Design a protein around this ligand. Structure first.
Ligand SMILES: Nc1ncnc2c1ncn2[C@@H]1O[C@H](COP(=O)(O)OP(=O)(O)OP(=O)(O)O)[C@@H](O)[C@H]1O
Lengths: 601, 272
DNA sequence: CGTTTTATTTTTTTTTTTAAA
């Protein structure tokens, strides 16, 4: 009904009259800048958004089908060359075909792209470009996709054009050529990859958020086919939001399994959005301790545990001597059953700590948290399909009540104590998998709540092999204190009468600001001046004497010294001064001492 | 200026440029660049001693020496490399006579080893017919599968026992074979002919640069007729090769074809 | 200048895995 032509005039006016002076800084040509970026042979994809055309008019806020507009604008600016020879493979290869002498898509050279979920996705959504957020599933890989090949006749010579949109196809035969027409001189048909056009191609399933799905519902997935430039633009288990099109899928073939008008739909892509800049404001603030003041406000007091965590948040200790690496990840252990809200801090960290994970005391047996295997006589063979502990690299996978899972379960996790090494002689390998995950252990005491008669490993039943792999072991008990629980109570009830706990003692730090300030930290690689080396080796001995002077005491591993070394240089990442010094390790030992000497007194 | 219609490459340029390079050759590492190194003759002439005197055929040789020489050779070798490499073999098969004209010049050579990669995880449309080399750890130990090259015919009357090899897939049919009087109709049989060997085993990339919580992604390719069980399988090894692609038979009812193309790599060489 | 196209299900033995007073 509407004209698909006079709109071409409208958009010519739009892009031509485009230096839109709404602010100091727009009299220059915006899409002229992008135009010349095409003339730079650089940009192969431009972009449309609601604001852009919204100011222009109000038709096309509901006209744009999303399909005809694209081919029209593409051909429109393809024939727009207001503007150098050897820039591309194919681009110069046409000149090679012209050295002795098309649709503008075959010289593609560029592209353009432009508050609901699958559940709400009402089935009158065809063609409309809509918005949904999900979770990625079943990570796959990318291959080339033809669009239009060049089936030359050789004897005749006529590089045939087979521009295709389908996903299945059929060959082109000997010759639809002019000289290979009724004029008897002809050869045969045969493509030339070099002059052919293909396109990247990434696909993966999309599962539901799991926060919307009603009481009587089961999450389901859709399919994602993103081709061309945008490939490799999301990993598995990223909570991502996509604007694209719903489009049906003409699954042609058999004439009785189809022929229902089957309509097994699918989706077309534009983008994978997943829900220094700070430097001037980072200049506004210079403090070390306020992180604890604004990280996890939900409980008053017990800062020491939190700062112990924030160190693991800090990081920044690693070296590769002798060819071999060193574990630069901290792994805390946790015993206790008070009301701590380990579940609290776990949820807090797992939210703010990007690339987080969670498992429970029996939810993942030894094969699930790591890679595993499967069985099916319908899809082919089976793979490892690693688990949370496999996936949580550059981060932490947080087990809750590792004490209660199982004794043999300590094995495979103990294997990852020596980091980045997940050996598997199961699928005919000694595979590695790079287990590069910081580890969070939290459990409860044994029968009772730290019965003072039943001593350590008298009350506990854990082999030394795992405690040795753990930098810090922490028992948490707070006996009846008349004054203690008061403050904690009124503190809790504050966000019950209210929504935001801590007033007027610090500036709260949002997830964004917190993460960004932490983002500026770890790349210092600071200086530990040489006097420490003689000094610290002395101080370590101070431990090893008061370890031996009582005979019913803890054993020690070389990691005790390696740990007390490992922690200090990390914290200088958040000092941001490349200056590992006395305080850098005096806090290390201080917190180590606080880890102990707490259960007798 | 004599060239494929769709390209910019020619035999004579690369041939002459490389023959001058090997004449610009004393071991340019150990006699021109690493003059502090030393084995002082063009090594390939030295090898035509130490190959012929060795009588020990199927040389192995790189081409990273060529960075000093004209790099246009490097490029057009990088991009058009199944159509220049035999030309560099032809230059060698000419070099035979520099050092021994009247040899038993009946054998050929085998053969790169110069260009880079980072990883297999992500490649591109650009990277389609180009030189690559990547490494990992091997998984399997395959069997052999040969491949045909020619038709050996038969006859009915007076023994029109014709023959002819293949371009890659066709033989023509007028009413007889190489139409010789057509005493009978066309003939063919497919055994007394040329066949060619290969296998297939895949590799698992295993560097220290493996992305976070990521799985194995793995690659694979055949062999050629000398590159066949060089291999006590399963260890840390590099390959060179040429990224290859192939369309796919859609469905299987009939000749429909797929949109998506499968890929593997051409089959050349290994490293220890 | 005419006359024709197209579907498969249950059980084994191995290697995985899993159960009760
Ligand atoms: N001082 C406090 N600060 C914040 N929250 C508190 C405090 N005291 C009690 N609470 C609340 O009391 C609840 C206690 O149950 P909780 O989730 O702590 O079990 P838990 O202590 O994690 O159990 P276990 O330690 O046995 O695993 C917590 O959710 C926490 O929110």
């Amino acid at each position: 009904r509407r004209d698909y032509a006079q709109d071409r005039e409208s958009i010519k006016t739009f892009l031509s009259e485009f230096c839109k002076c709404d602010d100091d800084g727009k009299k220059e040509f915006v899409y002229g800048s992008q135009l010349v970026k095409l003339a730079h042979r650089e940009q192969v994809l431009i972009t449309i958004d609601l604001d852009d055309l919204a100011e222009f008019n109000e038709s096309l806020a509901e006209a744009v089908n999303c399909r005809r507009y694209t081919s029209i604008f593409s051909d429109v600016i393809a024939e727009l060359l207001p503007s150098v020879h050897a820039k591309d493979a194919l681009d110069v290869y046409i000149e090679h075909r012209l050295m002795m002498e098309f649709p503008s898509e075959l010289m593609k050279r560029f592209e353009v792209g432009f508050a609901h979920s699958i559940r709400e996705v009402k089935a009158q959504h065809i063609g409309k470009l809509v918005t949904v957020r999900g979770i990625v599933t079943r990570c796959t890989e990318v291959k080339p996709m033809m669009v239009v090949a060049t089936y030359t006749c050789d004897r005749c010579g006529s590089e045939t054009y087979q521009p295709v949109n389908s996903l299945s196809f059929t060959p082109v035969h000997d010759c639809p050529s002019d000289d290979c027409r009724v004029n008897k001189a002809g050869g045969r048909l045969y493509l030339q990859t070099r002059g052919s056009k293909f396109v990247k191609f990434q696909e993966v399933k999309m599962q539901e958020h799991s926060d919307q799905v009603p009481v009587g519902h089961i999450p389901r997935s859709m399919t994602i086919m993103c081709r061309g430039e945008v490939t490799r633009m999301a990993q598995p288990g990223d909570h991502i939001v996509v604007s694209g099109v719903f489009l049906p899928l003409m699954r042609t073939g058999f004439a009785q399994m189809i022929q229902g008008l089957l309509s097994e739909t699918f989706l077309q892509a534009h983008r994978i959005i997943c829900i220094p800049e700070e430097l001037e404001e980072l200049a506004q603030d210079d403090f070390y301790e306020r992180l604890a003041t604004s990280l996890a406000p939900e409980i008053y007091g017990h800062l020491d545990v939190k700062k112990a965590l924030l160190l693991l948040l800090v990081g920044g200790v690693d070296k590769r001597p002798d060819g071999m690496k060193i574990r630069g990840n901290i792994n805390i252990c946790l015993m206790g059953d008070p009301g701590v809200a380990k579940s609290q801090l776990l949820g807090y960290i797992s939210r703010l700590a990007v690339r987080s994970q969670y498992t429970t005391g029996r939810g993942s047996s030894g094969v699930g948290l790591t890679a595993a295997v499967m069985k099916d006589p319908l899809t082919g063979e089976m793979t490892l399909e690693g688990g949370a502990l496999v996936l949580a690299d550059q981060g932490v996978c947080c087990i809750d009540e590792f004490d209660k899972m199982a004794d043999q379960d300590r094995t495979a996790i103990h294997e990852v104590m020596e980091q980045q090494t997940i050996s598997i002689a199961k699928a005919g390998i000694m595979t590695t998998l790079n287990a590069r995950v910081s580890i969070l252990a939290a459990a409860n005491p044994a029968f009772g709540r730290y019965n003072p008669r039943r001593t350590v490993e008298q009350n506990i039943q854990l082999p030394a092999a795992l405690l040795s792999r753990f930098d810090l072991l922490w028992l948490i008990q707070d006996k009846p204190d008349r004054d203690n629980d008061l403050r904690l109570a009124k503190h809790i009830t504050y966000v019950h009468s209210h929504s935001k706990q801590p007033p007027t003692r610090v500036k709260a730090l949002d997830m964004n600001l917190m993460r960004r300030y932490i983002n500026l930290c770890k790349r210092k690689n600071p200086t530990i001046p040489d006097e420490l080396t003689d000094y610290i080796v002395g101080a370590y001995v101070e431990l090893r004497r008061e370890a031996r002077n009582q005979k019913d005491m803890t054993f020690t591993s070389a990691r005790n010294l390696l740990g007390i070394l490992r922690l200090s240089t990390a914290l200088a990442r958040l000092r941001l001064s490349d200056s590992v010094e006395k305080d850098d390790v005096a806090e290390a030992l201080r917190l180590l001492e606080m880890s102990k000497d707490s259960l007798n007194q | 200026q004599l060239v494929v219609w769709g390209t910019n490459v020619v035999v004579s340029q690369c041939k002459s440029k490389f023959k001058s390079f090997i004449m610009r050759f004393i071991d340019p590492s150990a006699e021109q660049d690493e003059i502090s190194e030393n084995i002082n003759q063009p090594l390939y002439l030295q090898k035509l001693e130490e190959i012929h005197t060795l009588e020990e055929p199927y040389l192995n040789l790189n081409c990273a020496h060529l960075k000093t020489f004209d790099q246009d050779l490097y490029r057009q070798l990088i991009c058009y490399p199944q159509e220049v490499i035999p030309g560099f073999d032809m230059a060698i098969n000419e070099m035979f006579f520099e050092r021994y004209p009247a040899a038993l010049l009946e054998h050929q050579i085998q053969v790169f080893n110069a260009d880079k990669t980072r990883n297999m995880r992500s490649l591109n449309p650009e990277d389609m017919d180009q030189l690559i080399s990547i490494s990992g750890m091997v998984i399997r130990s395959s069997n052999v599968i040969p491949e045909m090259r020619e038709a050996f015919f038969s006859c009915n009357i007076c023994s029109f026992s014709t023959t002819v090899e293949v371009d890659r897939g066709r033989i023509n049919q007028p009413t007889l074979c190489t139409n010789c009087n057509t005493n009978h109709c066309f003939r063919l049989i497919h055994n007394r002919s040329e066949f060619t060997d290969k296998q297939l085993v895949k590799l698992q990339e295993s560097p220290d640069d493996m992305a976070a919580g990521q799985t194995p992604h793995n690659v694979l390719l055949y062999a050629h007729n000398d590159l066949v069980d060089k291999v006590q399988p399963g260890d840390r090894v590099t390959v060179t090769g040429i990224y290859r692609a192939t369309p796919l038979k859609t469905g299987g009812l009939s000749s429909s074809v797929k949109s998506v193309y499968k890929t593997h790599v051409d089959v050349v060489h290994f490293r220890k």
